[PDB]
Design a protein around this ligand. Structure first.
Ligand SMILES: NC(=O)c1ccc[n+]([C@@H]2O[C@H](COP(=O)([O-])OP(=O)(O)OC[C@H]3O[C@@H](n4cnc5c(N)ncnc54)[C@H](OP(=O)(O)O)[C@@H]3O)[C@@H](O)[C@H]2O)c1
Ligand SMILES: [NH3+]C1CCCCC1
Lengths: 340, 340
């Protein structure tokens, strides 16, 4: 006897709407919905997600999260809100206090152990105390992660791993556009983005690779450079026109040096696209032998959401704590989001 | 910790690569078997092209029991033949001496339906003697965990479509022979086409179904000769193949599941005209559609490196004939060492 996995969606923006539609297609049940956005509070989650039949799941503001957790009897909270642990920790604490497993697409949560050590250790203790698992997943899990380590499993010697990834700032909400400096003039970009040099998404995903490959990080160097176009580009995400020479987004170059010798160099571009530009994911393992993998035009948003859903049975089965996916076996295709 | 102790059975092109590379990863060659007249009584290091002899004389197979009793080996690597009926002799010797065996023999990757009785016999023998037998090679990642790791980021799979191509000349006589290299069209039809023996991707498609949790309903295979407009040399057979003779074999395997998804795999093993390269391109068709390309895979080096990376898992695995779908994916290993 199987029952649907019971999901609270926290963040009912572009990604959250995709997850609401897709979790139901896999046989899961939406049992709670939280969003602070004015336009969405009090609407039916089904309606907002573009379903034709309302779900009977009212979107609550976050100040009512404890009420929606107590009512919902959920197996899992999916959190699609912000990129950094400081801005995710509040929602993760709520899920943990209620003993509800949580998975976030928030990029830092993929591997936050050094970048937000104290928040991660506190959440790990709380999740342990309440007998639930927290984790970070998304596009990184396969495409900047297990894709590379499965190919490393066919490699005799690795000298260097080199990654090139690119995604469209317009496909995601304002947390991503903001992190990438979309619409900033060159001087403001340098001063706000370049100067503060906050860990890019591939800072955390390169640490995940080292953890799964069994390497120890010695140093990480990052440069954030504005991306630019010769014409004006419109940001539907931030609702701003970006004139030629203003930042259309950010290229991050991260070089991860290990004690063991190998280095991971990852170029990560989030920007507005000129006509004919597409998502990229290309990796080379340099050593013996040299191997290059190319994903032809990854459907980055769809792939993000599908790995989150495929992870859910492993998240339920996982031991309690904040357990990053480097400690899991790779995500497997799940036909139905149901549990015994 | 001590080096893993390896008997190399088959000291041809792949066996020479393994002898050189296993030592580079900190394993120790303790035995060598080869039936080739040119290699019998020579030092395995010398034959592998090392400048310093290893003190390991290549024995003919009629002396295999003697080399196993003497060597006290942890692992036998078997690089000889493609099909279980031709591998069984060596696997029986390894198992009777309680030594773990891993073969690049392609049927051994997943032989449970194609050679059921041989596999069940070897499984009980291996169990009686407290050792693990398995099949690995290029298939393990590039026709296997590469696909299932991408499947982990997929919402719905309708069809998996594979195109792979390798150079018949990179592997020695047994593979050239299996691919009908140098056969005239009539002999090809009669020996190869007519008998329709399981191509390598018959067994690898069954492995994919086992790891994705699908049940095979039917498998259909067409074997067609490959041809060139010019004469080509097989360095493995040392013969010229004139225009219109078989330069190798294209296999098309359609694997239908009870669940609905189908795996359609196109597999070409042939002599290469100038400019031709190895290929490995897969599409997961469904939601979303994902295409992965390996740019000119170094198929031989990848075959050997995944066998070595598998060794710690082969030692750890329970006794019996345990196909690699029951293992977690191969992981990059720096040092081939074991306890006590
Ligand atoms: N790991 C990955 O592979 C991956 C993939 C895609 C996106 N992401 C990231 O995950 C996050 C969500 O992406 P998205 O594109 O769906 O952004 P989005 O369209 O802005 O949607 C997020 C929703 O959450 C709301 N929100 C933000 N903070 C909240 C809080 N504390 N409580 C309740 N609701 C809150 C937002 O409201 P407002 O609009 O009012 O702020 C919005 O409705 C972003 O930071 C993005 O970078 C990660
Ligand atoms: N951070 C998300 C947006 C695209 C890159 C990886 C997933």
């Amino acid at each position: 006897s199987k029952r649907p996995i019971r999901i609270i969606q926290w963040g009912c923006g572009l990604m959250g709407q995709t997850l609401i539609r897709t979790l139901r297609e896999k046989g899961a049940e939406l049992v709670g919905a939280i969003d602070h956005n004015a336009a969405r509070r009090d609407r039916d989650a089904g309606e907002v997600a573009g379903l034709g039949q309302s779900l009977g799941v009212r979107i609550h503001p976050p100040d009512q999260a404890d009420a929606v957790f107590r009512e919902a009897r959920a197996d899992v909270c999916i959190l699609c809100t912000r990129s950094i642990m400081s801005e995710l920790a509040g929602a993760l604490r709520v899920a943990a206090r209620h003993g509800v497993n949580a998975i976030t697409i928030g990029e830092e949560a993929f591997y936050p152990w050094t970048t937000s050590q104290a928040l991660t250790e506190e959440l790990d203790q709380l999740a342990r105390a309440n007998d639930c698992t927290l984790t970070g997943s998304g596009f990184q899990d396969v495409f900047w992660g297990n894709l590379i380590t499965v190919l490393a499993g066919a490699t005799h010697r690795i000298d260097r791993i080199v990654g090139l990834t690119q995604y469209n700032a317009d496909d995601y909400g304002s947390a991503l556009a903001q992190k990438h400096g979309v619409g900033l003039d060159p001087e403001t970009f340098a001063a706000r983005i370049g100067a503060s040099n906050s860990p890019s998404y591939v800072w955390n995903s390169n640490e995940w690779l080292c953890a799964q490959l069994g390497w120890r990080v010695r140093d990480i160097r990052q440069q954030l450079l504005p991306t630019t176009h010769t014409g004006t580009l419109r940001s539907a995400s931030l609702g701003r026109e970006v004139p030629a020479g203003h930042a259309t987004g950010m290229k991050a170059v991260v070089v991860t040096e290990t004690h063991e010798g190998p280095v991971i160099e990852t170029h990560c571009v989030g920007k507005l696209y000129a006509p004919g530009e597409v998502d990229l994911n290309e990796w080379t393992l340099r050593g013996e032998p040299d191997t290059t993998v190319t994903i032809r035009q990854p459907a980055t948003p769809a792939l993000t959401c599908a790995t989150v859903l495929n992870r859910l049975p492993q998240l339920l089965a996982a031991p309690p704590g904040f357990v990053t996916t480097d400690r899991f076996t790779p995500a497997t295709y799940v036909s139905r989001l149901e549990t015994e």
